[PDB]
Amino acid sequence: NLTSSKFEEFMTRHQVHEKEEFKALKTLSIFYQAGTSKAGNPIFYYVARRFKTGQINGDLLIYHVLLTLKPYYAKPYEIVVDLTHTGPSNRFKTDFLSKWFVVFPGFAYDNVSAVYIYNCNSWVREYTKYHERLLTGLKGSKRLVFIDCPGKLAEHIEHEQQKLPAATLALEEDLKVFHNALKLAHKDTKVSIKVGSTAVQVTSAERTKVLGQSVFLNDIYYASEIEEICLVDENQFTLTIANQGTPLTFMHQECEAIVQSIIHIRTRWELSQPDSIPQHTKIR
């Protein structure tokens, strides 16, 4: 016995406004409205990074999102979702996911002008496969438009109005490209590796099918998270990362050239961090 009217009344009766945990969401800048688009519809930006699985009550997040969309969701609107550096830590459970379909009044769903997805990664694709049933409605969705490369979104969105996260742009994908690196694994897929200043971004060069739309996956690994860096051979190198099980092996004609930078990147962070002596504390 739950509906949009019921949910709104309950939360309104609850004093969520002064909880001081609702206020924190404003600082985190999750689902903030950003200017307009080519059609003139307002734009909103949802940041996947900013949400932890359990540290905060999940209903307050919905109320904040609903509150912001209430004034404008009557008219058609465009929403862009940033899934950069998505991880299992920031996720929606099966039960909590379902509420999104029902809590909103329902007529706003029809006012979804267009959807933009940026900096998707394989983990997100894996999540969709597991939760396919609930998302079957969005299967082959016309409103879903995937930003395969950065050079496309700026065209469709009003440039100088888009306000994507500064940290995302800070990476800028502005470092050397080791084109035609091959990801040796059960199956081999061409991966383009950029050794960024503070992180390493692996951009696949082969399109993949997610919800019936082709897109290129771009996994991002922060330099701080690079615990293990082993160069087994100049033909291929080994990159094990925290709680990732089997390491990632790739083939490049000059592995030490890439690994040299990775060691250079990691070594710089070691100086940046205050204390590397505290470590471990967990035996898997």
From Swiss-Prot:
Segments of this protein annotated with the region Lipid binding: 18-275
Lineage: superkingdom: Eukaryota
Documented effect of changing R133A: Reduces phospholipid binding
Modification comment: Ubiquitinated by RNF7/RBX2, leading to its degradation.
Location of this chain's protein in the cell: Nucleus; Nucleus, Nucleolus; Cell membrane
Tissue specificity comment: Detected in brain, peripheral nerve, lung, colon and muscle.
Domain CRAL-TRIO: 18-176
Domain notes: Binds phospholipids via its C-terminal CRAL-TRIO domain. Binds primarily glycerophospholipids with monounsaturated C18:1 and/or C16:1 fatty acid moieties and a phosphatidylethanolamine or phosphatidylcholine headgroup. Has lesser affinity for lipids containing phosphatidylserine and phosphatidylinositol.
Function: Stimulates the GTPase activity of Ras. NF1 shows greater affinity for Ras GAP, but lower specific activity. May be a regulator of Ras activity.
Quaternary structure, from the entry: Interacts with HTR6. Interacts with SPRED2.
Disorder noted: Neurofibromatosis 1: A disease characterized by patches of skin pigmentation (cafe-au-lait spots), Lisch nodules of the iris, tumors in the peripheral nervous system and fibromatous skin tumors. Individuals with the disorder have increased susceptibility to the development of benign and malignant tumors.
Name of the protein in its database record: Neurofibromin
Organism of origin: Homo sapiens (Human)
Gene for this chain: NF1
Shown chain mapped onto the complete sequence: 1563 to 1846 of 2839
